[PDB]
Design a protein around this ligand. Sequence first.
Ligand SMILES: [Mg+2]
Ligand SMILES: [Mg+2]
Ligand SMILES: [Mg+2]
Ligand SMILES: [Mg+2]
Ligand SMILES: [Mg+2]
Ligand SMILES: [Mg+2]
Ligand SMILES: [Mg+2]
Ligand SMILES: [Mg+2]
Ligand SMILES: [Mg+2]
Ligand SMILES: [Mg+2]
Ligand SMILES: [Mg+2]
Ligand SMILES: [Mg+2]
Ligand SMILES: [Mg+2]
Ligand SMILES: [Mg+2]
Ligand SMILES: [Mg+2]
Ligand SMILES: [Mg+2]
Ligand SMILES: [Mg+2]
Ligand SMILES: [Mg+2]
Ligand SMILES: [Mg+2]
Ligand SMILES: [Mg+2]
Ligand SMILES: [Mg+2]
Ligand SMILES: [Mg+2]
Ligand SMILES: [Mg+2]
Ligand SMILES: [Mg+2]
Ligand SMILES: [Mg+2]
Ligand SMILES: [Mg+2]
Ligand SMILES: [Mg+2]
Ligand SMILES: [Mg+2]
Ligand SMILES: [Mg+2]
Ligand SMILES: [Mg+2]
Ligand SMILES: [Mg+2]
Ligand SMILES: [Mg+2]
Ligand SMILES: [Mg+2]
Ligand SMILES: [Mg+2]
Ligand SMILES: [Mg+2]
Ligand SMILES: [Mg+2]
Ligand SMILES: [Mg+2]
Ligand SMILES: [Mg+2]
Ligand SMILES: [Mg+2]
Ligand SMILES: [Mg+2]
Ligand SMILES: [Mg+2]
Ligand SMILES: [Mg+2]
Lengths: 148, 185, 156, 127
Amino acid sequence: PSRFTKTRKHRGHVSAGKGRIGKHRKHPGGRGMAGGQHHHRINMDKYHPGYFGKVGMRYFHKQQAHFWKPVLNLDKLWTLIPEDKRDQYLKSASKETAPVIDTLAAGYGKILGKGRIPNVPVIVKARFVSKLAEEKIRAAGGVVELIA
Amino acid sequence: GIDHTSKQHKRSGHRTAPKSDNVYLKLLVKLYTFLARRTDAPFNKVVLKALFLSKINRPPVSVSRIARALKQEGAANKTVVVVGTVTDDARIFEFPKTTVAALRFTAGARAKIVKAGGECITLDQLAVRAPKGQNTLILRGPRNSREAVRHFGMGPHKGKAPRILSTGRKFERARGRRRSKGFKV
Amino acid sequence: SAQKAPKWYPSEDVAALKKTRKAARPQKLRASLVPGTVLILLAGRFRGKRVVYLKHLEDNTLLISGPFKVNGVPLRRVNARYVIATSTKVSVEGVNVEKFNVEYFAKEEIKAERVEDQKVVDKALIAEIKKTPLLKQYLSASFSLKNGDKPHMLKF
Amino acid sequence: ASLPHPKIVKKHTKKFKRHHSDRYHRVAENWRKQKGIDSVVRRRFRGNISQPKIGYGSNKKTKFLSPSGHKTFLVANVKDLETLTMHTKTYAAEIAHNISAKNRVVILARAKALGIKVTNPKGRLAL
RNA sequence: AAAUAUUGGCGAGAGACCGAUAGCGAACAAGUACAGUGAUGGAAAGAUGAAAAGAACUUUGAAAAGAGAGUGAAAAAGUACGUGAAAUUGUUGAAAGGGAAGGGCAUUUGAUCAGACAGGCCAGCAUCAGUUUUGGUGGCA
RNA sequence: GACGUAAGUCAAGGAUGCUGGCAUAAUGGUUAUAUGCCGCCCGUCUUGAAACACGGACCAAGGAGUCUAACGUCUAUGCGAGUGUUUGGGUGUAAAACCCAUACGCGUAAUGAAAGUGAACGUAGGUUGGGGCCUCGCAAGAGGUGCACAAUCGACCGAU
RNA sequence: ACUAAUCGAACCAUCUAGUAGCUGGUUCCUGCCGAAGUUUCCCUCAGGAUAGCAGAAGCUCGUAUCAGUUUUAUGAGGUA
RNA sequence: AAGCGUGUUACCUAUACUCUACCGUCAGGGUUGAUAUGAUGCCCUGACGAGUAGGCAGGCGUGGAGGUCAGUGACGAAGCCUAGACCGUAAGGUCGGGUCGAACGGCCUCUAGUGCAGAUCUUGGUGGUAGUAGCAAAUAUUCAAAUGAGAACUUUGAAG
Ligand SMILES: [Mg+2]
Ligand SMILES: [Mg+2]
Ligand SMILES: [Mg+2]
Ligand SMILES: [Mg+2]
Ligand SMILES: [Mg+2]
Ligand SMILES: [Mg+2]
Ligand SMILES: [Mg+2]
Ligand SMILES: [Mg+2]
Ligand SMILES: [Mg+2]
Ligand SMILES: [Mg+2]
Ligand SMILES: [Mg+2]
Ligand SMILES: [Mg+2]
Ligand SMILES: [Mg+2]
Ligand SMILES: [Mg+2]
Ligand SMILES: [Mg+2]
Ligand SMILES: [Mg+2]
Ligand SMILES: [Mg+2]
Ligand SMILES: [Mg+2]
Ligand SMILES: [Mg+2]
Ligand SMILES: [Mg+2]
Ligand SMILES: [Mg+2]
Ligand SMILES: [Mg+2]
Ligand SMILES: [Mg+2]
Ligand SMILES: [Mg+2]
Ligand SMILES: [Mg+2]
Ligand SMILES: [Mg+2]
Ligand SMILES: [Mg+2]
Ligand SMILES: [Mg+2]
Ligand SMILES: [Mg+2]
Ligand SMILES: [Mg+2]
Ligand SMILES: [Mg+2]
Ligand SMILES: [Mg+2]
Ligand SMILES: [Mg+2]
Ligand SMILES: [Mg+2]
Ligand SMILES: [Mg+2]
Ligand SMILES: [Mg+2]
Ligand SMILES: [Mg+2]
Ligand SMILES: [Mg+2]
Ligand SMILES: [Mg+2]
Ligand SMILES: [Mg+2]
Ligand SMILES: [Mg+2]
Ligand SMILES: [Mg+2]
């Protein structure tokens, strides 16, 4: 709000904090990104390297939903089982009754391997996995069942 | 006239109080100010200073961070003390039975610690049962893992994160960032 | 409320004084003040009158009877720092000054006691002033400074 | 009778008038600091007015005290007055300017009963 | 069709908005008065009192008007109307003034003014404490 | 601390005692004047202003860092691997308050131009410090554990 | 030259609060701290960015690491 | 010599040095089983105090808003004037007296179109100059009467 601003403190002082010499003007260096290659070059090269120039391929008519693939990691994989019923599977870590985790409905397209799941076998239904994510699921006695 | 070697009237540059107006945090400061003055225990002076800390200066402490500090030999039976917020961590599947003292517990953190057989107490229950902070374990969360710290000290060849709104190709991956376009940093 | 309130007020309790280490000790006069010495009174009703120093009272005031029959100055006190001590003395080992004190000069037409006290004390004064010549006229004349008398070089 | 207090030291009994408040009518005597780059008053040249500064602060044992030794508390009605019933020596009452004449009789009579000093026991008195 | 738009029109309800140099240019006979050949430009201007009870009557004056009288709570509300600031001015009173005035520290003089007897005001002396200054004198190397 | 055998006293961690006058314009304040000495006109630009630099005859009223979109640092608060009720819907004492589903934004993954691939050898490593805590010690200190943080060498992920 | 007191491009309204690295102004008090007119780059030279100087917020610790200083030892220098 | 050179003392006086007091700032501390109930308090100790541009902090004032003082007021609110008083270092606050006639404050918070000496600032009002410069081109007016409160200037007559 207004009463806490330095404008109220600068009342009575001539230059309002802008100086007597610099003498606050309209646009002393230009407007916006003016002079990014001429007289603001040092600031742009120091703080925004890469700004000027061209990089690789263009992509006409990009639809981001083509590339939709949220990643889930193995240390977060057991969060897709509900909180209460999770403990039942942790005991009796055996086959023939293994939790089916369908990560697509949980909103994930790829399962990644950040790792260290418990040794409970688990059935993972994923659109995509990595080699290491699959390896640790099979090292626990589970299976990655590919879905679409 | 005095040939002054140092700046005169210089403030210490440390908080002597929390900037917070929390009436309950002020009672905790009031109790530990008394404790740090009438006892010679270094723990009471450390906790008192930590109760002045700003929000970024007390990062959250995970229960997994708590549990890793209990893998130190002889530290299992110590009372973990966190001057800040204890959060939950789903990545860790076993939690020991321990007593944790914190300013705040998240609901997931309090559930996980209690379900393990442990106990969650406030810093004034800690003061009653450990007036000199005997058998305690102060844990602090990582300070520089904040995203803001990524951009601190930006410059050529320093490998820091640029302050940028939109990322991807076309956003600062050109002249200045690869030898094919001018120079690399 | 025209003014809000003081949330707390200063205490009405009055503090006792710290115990002070200032013992009262007797005054030492300057050595020129010896009983019987003639003094000049430098202020008062009797400015300039020359009187006899008789007794040193307990309240640090000099007792003078520069005889009333000689120059009208009665039995009264004067401040020590307000008199000039002269080199000439007159013997006062015949006057009874013991009964004169602060209570004799306490405040609360002259008293019949005081007129008779003066005659008793100056009888032993006036008689022994006559021993050496010219004092009776000397004490009956008031002192003054003339056009060239410098008190820093004058002797008394 | 007020509480015993030291001698009252003011350190500056003279008002700090504004510079040139007697030169131009448009310059009021309310104190204003000179901000001029060339101001002899700001630069503290000999012969010019003094400037308010913290060295003139009244003694804390004596600040806010009237010469009689009381602190002034502004009262508006009877209820405001018994706030000073237990503080008669350290505070004195002052009837507010807007209090009616018939209500001033009530406060003056009540203060005289409680032994409260009134700094203005003559306002709106038809005498 | 509907959901959408709406600084125009009509009818409503509101506001942490403005309060007569503000808020629309315009609270009022305001797009008026007025200016310009014309396109256009474009103000200023609200408040007696509860009620006009808006001062009958006398007197001076050619009259305006004045002095009374009177109405009114008030004329320190008289349509030159609530209050009525400052610049600027008249009278009265005080004060000072040999080529400006004004100001800062201190005091004299004049004028004016607050408070307090259950210790307030101004002082004198003695013995001490702290800081100094100026002498007299003694014993040693 | 000193003296005193002690009792106690003292000039030893800051003035007490005695006496007088007045009790009001006496002291004091304010104000006018006089006297001693001093005092150039403010604001601005400027290396430099009393300037023969500029604005200012006077007075009243008005009169100049605001609001918005997006954002950086810091701080406070709520929750916390999540978080954001208010686009909407429900409800209402009706522009308020109260309640809510699915989404969506940001975060929880990076990297490459891309196609793509995608984070534990180990007690999530080793070394040097490191507050605090533990053990032994009257303590000094010694040993153990050492969060944050700092330096460094490694391990893992992506590109090459 | 003249084109309504207007002419090296009339007047009126609007775009338009046109832009200004330039001139002027920029409204209360007290307290604490306290500058620069130098570096590099710029169609730059009455301007900016950048580093420096300054303030504020602090944070980790608690007498360290130090130092507009000297000594001792060991170098270097090409001015008087 | 009251000049020049040189020597000796004494003396004068800065916002400087010493001591003390007061104010503020900073720093280090003390203080809870009654802190003799205010721990953003009270108190002990030491040092420090120049300042443009500029930064920050604590406060004073104005318009409006939520709360409260069952606040003030036609027995006089607000406003205005006041070489009358009191408080504050100050921004300012309070009281008395006069004028006036209908609303307006204290405190805790919220909010902003929130504080003027300047801008050849805007609008309005007012001065000194100053009873001043001036009211001097176009030949020229005069006498009497009448009217009228009043005639250089109107009317009539006469004359020029
Ligand atoms: Mg300027
Ligand atoms: Mg170029
Ligand atoms: Mg004053
Ligand atoms: Mg002023
Ligand atoms: Mg200057
Ligand atoms: Mg429709
Ligand atoms: Mg208008
Ligand atoms: Mg009017
Ligand atoms: Mg009236
Ligand atoms: Mg009037
Ligand atoms: Mg009126
Ligand atoms: Mg009027
Ligand atoms: Mg006037
Ligand atoms: Mg003359
Ligand atoms: Mg002495
Ligand atoms: Mg006087
Ligand atoms: Mg004078
Ligand atoms: Mg002079
Ligand atoms: Mg120049
Ligand atoms: Mg100047
Ligand atoms: Mg110019
Ligand atoms: Mg001019
Ligand atoms: Mg104004
Ligand atoms: Mg503009
Ligand atoms: Mg323009
Ligand atoms: Mg300084
Ligand atoms: Mg310039
Ligand atoms: Mg050479
Ligand atoms: Mg050379
Ligand atoms: Mg000589
Ligand atoms: Mg200063
Ligand atoms: Mg400044
Ligand atoms: Mg207001
Ligand atoms: Mg009034
Ligand atoms: Mg006046
Ligand atoms: Mg009315
Ligand atoms: Mg404004
Ligand atoms: Mg003005
Ligand atoms: Mg100004
Ligand atoms: Mg002007
Ligand atoms: Mg003339
Ligand atoms: Mg003519």
